[PDB]
C-alpha cells in the first residue's frame, strides 16, 4: 500500500527555514516523481517543485525564487522540502504527492505557521446565559499557535456544539468562540463548563459558564 | 503560467441531481488535466486523469470531458458523500496549476436564525478589552448581514466573523460576529446591539443590552 507519511507540523519566525520530511513506502521510491504542493487561503493550492528519486534531479516553481530545496535519501525513501526565508504568506499545509497523470497519492499534510508571535496560552471567559432554548459558552481568545481543543462537560455535551474557526486578530493572537443551545429550563439544575486545551502552553483550564 | 480558472466558485445541490463544473484554462493544456475531490481537513484525492480518465476505484457517477482550454467535470447523481470541494489541475507545463475551487454544498429549505447577544464578562473587563459576540444559531442559506450598532450609531471595521462548516444533522450554518473594543471605549457607551438580516426573517431582528445592565 502506498504510502507517504509527513513530518508533524512547524512553527516558524519570519527569516528563518522549515524542513518537511516525507517517508514513502510500498513502493519503488527511486521510479516515481515526488512533488511538494501547498495550500492556504487566498492563493489556494500552489506546485513548488519535484525531485526524481532515481538520480536526484529536482525542478523547482520560479514564484519560490530559489527559496526550495527538495532533496531526497534513497538509503531511507525520505524526501525532504526545505523552504528558507520564510514570510507570513508562507504559513499554508505543506504536501507531498507522487505523481502519474495528476497525483493519485498524497501525504497527510504538515502545517507550517510563520509568525512574529511567541507562544501563548488562552484566556477563557464565559459567554453566560442571559438574554425555551437557551444559548452560552466560551470565549478563547489571544492564543498562539493553533490549535487549541474545546470540549463541554468534558466531552459529555455535544449535541448543539458550534466551535467556531479561530480568526487571526490584528495582534498575531488567535480567538475563537465555543457555543451550545441548551434548554432554559437546565440553567438551574445543570452544571456546563468548558474545557479548553493548549497543549503548546501547556494550558489545560476548566470555566464553569453560569447565568448572569 | 496558465491560470485554471473554475465556474462556479460554489453551487448548492440536491443528493440525486446532476452536478456540472467547468474549468477554463488561459492557453491550451491538451488533456493533461487532473480532478480532485477535498473534504476538510484532508488532502485532495485523485478523481480523474487526463482529462476524461476516471481514476482506479473512482465510482461511475465521475466523468470529465474536454480538450485544449475548456474542460467540465460532472456528477450524474449526487450522493451524500459528494458535498465537498473540487478542483482542477493542469500538468501540461511548468509551473503545474490549480482552479481556486468549487464548493458543492448541500440545499435544503430555507431556515432564520435564532439570534443571541453576550456581553463582555466581568472576567474579561478586569484585563483591559471587551469582546461583545453576536451568535447566529443553525440557519440557512449561508447569506447572512450582521451588522452592529453602538448608541445607535452604524459600526464599521471593528468586528470579525466566523462560520462553521455545514451541520452534519440539519445543514445548517452557525455564524459568530465579534465586535471587540478598548475597556475604556467600551465604557464610553450605553447600548450595543446587533441586527441580522437574512432571507429567512420578514424583516431584520436586533439583539441588545444597555452596558452594565
Ligand atoms: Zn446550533
Ligand atoms: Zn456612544
Known amino acids: 500500500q502506498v504510502q507517504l507519511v509527513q513530518s508533524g507540523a512547524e512553527v516558524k519566525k519570519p527569516g528563518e527555514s522549515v524542513k518537511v520530511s516525507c517517508k514513502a513506502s510500498?513502493?519503488?521510491?527511486?521510479?516515481?516523481?515526488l512533488h511538494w504542493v501547498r495550500q492556504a487561503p487566498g492563493q489556494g493550492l500552489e506546485w513548488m517543485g519535484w525531485i526524481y528519486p532515481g538520480n536526484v534531479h529536482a525542478q523547482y516553481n520560479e514564484k519560490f525564487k530559489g527559496r526550495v530545496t527538495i532533496t531526497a535519501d534513497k538509503s531511507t525513501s525520505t524526501a525532504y522540502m526545505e523552504l528558507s526565508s520564510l514570510r507570513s504568506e508562507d504559513t499554508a499545509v505543506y504536501y507531498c504527492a507522487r505523481s502519474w497523470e495528476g497525483f493519485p497519492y498524497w501525504g497527510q499534510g504538515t502545517t507550517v505557521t510563520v509568525s512574529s508571535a511567541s507562544t501563548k496560552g488562552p484566556s477563557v471567559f464565559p459567554l453566560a446565559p442571559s438574554s425555551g432554548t437557551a444559548a452560552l459558552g466560551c470565549l478563547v481568545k489571544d492564543y498562539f499557535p493553533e490549535p487549541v481543543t474545546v470540549s463541554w462537560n468534558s466531552g459529555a455535551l455535544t449535541s448543539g456544539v458550534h466551535t467556531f474557526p479561530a480568526v487571526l486578530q490584528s495582534s498575531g493572537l488567535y480567538s475563537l468562540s465555543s457555543v451550545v443551545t441548551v434548554p432554559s429550563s437546565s440553567l438551574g439544575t445543570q452544571t456546563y463548563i468548558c474545557n479548553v486545551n493548549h497543549k503548546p502552553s501547556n494550558t489545560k483550564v476548566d470555566k464553569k459558564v453560569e447565568p448572569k | 503560467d496558465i491560470q485554471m480558472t473554475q465556474s462556479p466558485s460554489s453551487l448548492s445541490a440536491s443528493v440525486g441531481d446532476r452536478v456540472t463544473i467547468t474549468c477554463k484554462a488561459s492557453?491550451?493544456?491538451?488533456?493533461?488535466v487532473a480532478w480532485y475531490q477535498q473534504k476538510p481537513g484532508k488532502a485532495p484525492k485523485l478523481l480523474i486523469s487526463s482529462a476524461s480518465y476516471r481514476y482506479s476505484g473512482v465510482p461511475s457517477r465521475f466523468s470529465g470531458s474536454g480538450s485544449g482550454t475548456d474542460f467540465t467535470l460532472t456528477i450524474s447523481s449526487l450522493q451524500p458523500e459528494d458535498f465537498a470541494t473540487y478542483f482542477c489541475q493542469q500538468y501540461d507545463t511548468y509551473p503545474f496549476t490549480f482552479g481556486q475551487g468549487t464548493k458543492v454544498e448541500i440545499k435544503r429549505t430555507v431556515a432564520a436564525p435564532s439570534v443571541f447577544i453576550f456581553p463582555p464578562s466581568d472576567e474579561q473587563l478586569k484585563s483591559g478589552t471587551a469582546s461583545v459576540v453576536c451568535l447566529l444559531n443553525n440557519f440557512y442559506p449561508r447569506e447572512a448581514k450582521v451588522q452592529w450598532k453602538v448608541d445607535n450609531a452604524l459600526q464599521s471595521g471593528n468586528s470579525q466573523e466566523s462560520v462553521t462548516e455545514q451541520d452534519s444533522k440539519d445543514s445548517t450554518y452557525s455564524l459568530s460576529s465579534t465586535l471587540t473594543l478598548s475597556k475604556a471605549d467600551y465604557e464610553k457607551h450605553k447600548v450595543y446591539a446587533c441586527e441580522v438580516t437574512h432571507q429567512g426573517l420578514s424583516s431584520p431582528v436586533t439583539k441588545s443590552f444597555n452596558r452594565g445592565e
Open positions: 492557453q491550451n493544456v491538451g488533456i493533461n
Open positions: 510500498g513502493y519503488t521510491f527511486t521510479t516515481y516523481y
